[PDB]
């Protein structure tokens, strides 16, 4: 099955600063606001279509990762799509969930962050702990970004 949500949020930051936090600079942003992430690392992959990375976490003292893949990037649309495609961190009832973002401008020199959430369940239902468990995941990430950008302009 597949399971879509879309996911709207306003932000103050410009688009193109948000932007290049969300992707460029995410491997980078996301260990220092999300405690349980060490590290990330490109495993598979030079930045082309395809690049995988593996984003290593503890949990609950046990080490364990997600594995990320790249499925598109357009810097001059400020549009980038994702796939969270296997690893301990991706519930055993998925395929993966792949992700849809675009930062629109927003008033006043802000954003608008558009996300399309899509859950590839291995049958035909989707459990509500595993795409509410996600969905505070995801929303999260681009909060923790996001308040990492406006607490850090300078970063």
Known sequence: ???????????TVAPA??????????????????????????????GGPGTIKKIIAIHDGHTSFVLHKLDAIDEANLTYNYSII????L?????????????????DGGSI?????????????????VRDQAKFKG??????????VLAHPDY
Do not use: R, W
């Not at 099955?1 to 932000?11: D, K, V």
């Not at 992707?23 to 992959?45: A, F, L, M, N, R």
């Not at 296997?86 to 961190?89: I, Q, S, Y």
């Not at 962050?113 to 702990?129: R, Y």
């Open 1 to 11: 099955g597949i399971f879509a949500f879309e996911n709207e949020q306003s932000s």
């Open 17 to 46: 600063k948000l932007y290049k936090a969300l992707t460029k600079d995410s491997d980078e942003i996301v260990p220092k606001v999300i405690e349980p992430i060490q590290s990330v690392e490109i495993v598979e992959g030079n």
């Open 86 to 89: 296997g690893g301990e961190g």
């Open 91 to 107: 519930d055993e009832s998925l395929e993966k969930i792949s992700y849809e973002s675009k930062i629109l401008p927003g008033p």
């Open 113 to 129: 962050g558009k996300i399309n959430v899509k859950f590839h369940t291995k049958g035909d239902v989707l459990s509500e702990t």
């Open 139 to 148: 929303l999260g990430l681009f909060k923790a970004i996001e308040g990492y």
